[PDB]
Design goal:
It catalyses: L-seryl-[protein] + ATP = O-phospho-L-seryl-[protein] + ADP + H(+); L-threonyl-[protein] + ATP = O-phospho-L-threonyl-[protein] + ADP + H(+). The protein is α+β, with helices and mostly antiparallel strands. It has helices at residues 58-73, 109-113, 120-139, 175-178, 188-202, 212-223, 228-231, 237-245, 254-257, 263-272, 283-287, 318-330, and strands at residues 4-9, 12-17, 20-28, 32-39, 44-51, 84-86, 99-103, 107-108, 152-154, 160-162. The longest helix has 20 residues, at 120-139.
Length: 336
Amino acid sequence: RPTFYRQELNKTIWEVPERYQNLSPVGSGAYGSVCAAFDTKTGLRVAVKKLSRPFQSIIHAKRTYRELRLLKHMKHENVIGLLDVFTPARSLEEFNDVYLVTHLMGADLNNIVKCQKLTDDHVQFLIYQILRGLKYIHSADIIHRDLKPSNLAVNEDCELKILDFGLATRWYRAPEIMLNWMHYNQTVDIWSVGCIMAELLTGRTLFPGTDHIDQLKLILRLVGTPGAELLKKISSESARNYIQSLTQMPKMNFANVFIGANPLAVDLLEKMLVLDSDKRITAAQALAHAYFAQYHDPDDEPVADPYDQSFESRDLLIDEWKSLTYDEVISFVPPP
Ligand SMILES: CN(C)c1cc(-c2ccncc2)c(-c2ccc3ccccc3c2)nn1
Ligand SMILES: Fc1ccc(-c2n[nH]cc2-c2ccncc2)cc1
Ligand SMILES: Fc1ccc(-c2n[nH]cc2-c2ccncc2)cc1
Ligand SMILES: [Zn+2]
């Protein structure tokens, strides 16, 4: 076991191995807090996340396990992964805190688009990277579900990573989720990418809904109200009544709406912002789109190893989730 040292930062206690020095608070979330630090062992700047109340309930405990299982599995350039995971606990009985370590990332996509507007080359590179990461995640039968600019880490070099997804959101959400459809698919994430891309090209939020109903309205005004084929798939009586009760609207001409943008980007946007999710382009297909000809390489867009999500259907005791999480901490093998 390594030697740990203790300190308090922004009301939070950090108990970390001596190898991590110069801890500096980067921010706090509802699920944990993060410090930037220097990893003396590798010479790298890292971000250290201390999970908040990881075993407070069955929900937290299961979430903590999910987070650790997912992060231990993600090994891809465009997906946040683990350099280290540790706990100051010396045994399972005293196990109460979990710390996660990854490469320090300087900013998020929201910071970038917010000041100022991006060149077409940057939009190509940034979206390409999202999609490359998404291909990988999707290949593991995982759906991100909450992709948005604040969840995309980007460094000075324009390198991008999808964050732990894992642990207003509304604006980037697929319309079928606004309708509370219980059987949405992986293309909910493609919808989000389309919204992000649009924003990077125009400098404006595409669908700034004030609530779920307004969100749906803004979406239908751009893409049109659903046609017959899509209406047939809506099992909910009330949702169908509502939708069909709306003044019918035509799909707008994307070339006109995003005029000035690279026509290839407009073409791709149209393939991503398809109302019927069964007809939306997938991440793998999007990577092959001509818009990314300068970046696409089918021999360098890997898929993920199989990911066992069976635990998701289990109803276990807090101590069981805790012990499973503890095993995962102890079995972690750092990357080379
Ligand atoms: C912006 N946001 C919601 C973030 C931003 C970060 C972050 C900030 C700076 N560099 C890297 C990440 C982490 C975060 C921070 C540390 C992490 C450590 C291990 C695994 C995942 C981690 C995720 N989690 N969420
Ligand atoms: F005014 C109304 C009328 C009907 C609905 C409704 N019934 N089922 C689903 C919905 C609905 C409508 C808009 N956005 C999400 C869900 C919501 C508001
Ligand atoms: F108004 C809309 C907006 C989106 C959808 C939609 N797109 N893909 C799947 C659906 C959908 C929504 C509700 N129930 C089944 C399927 C359907 C109607
Ligand atoms: Zn909670």
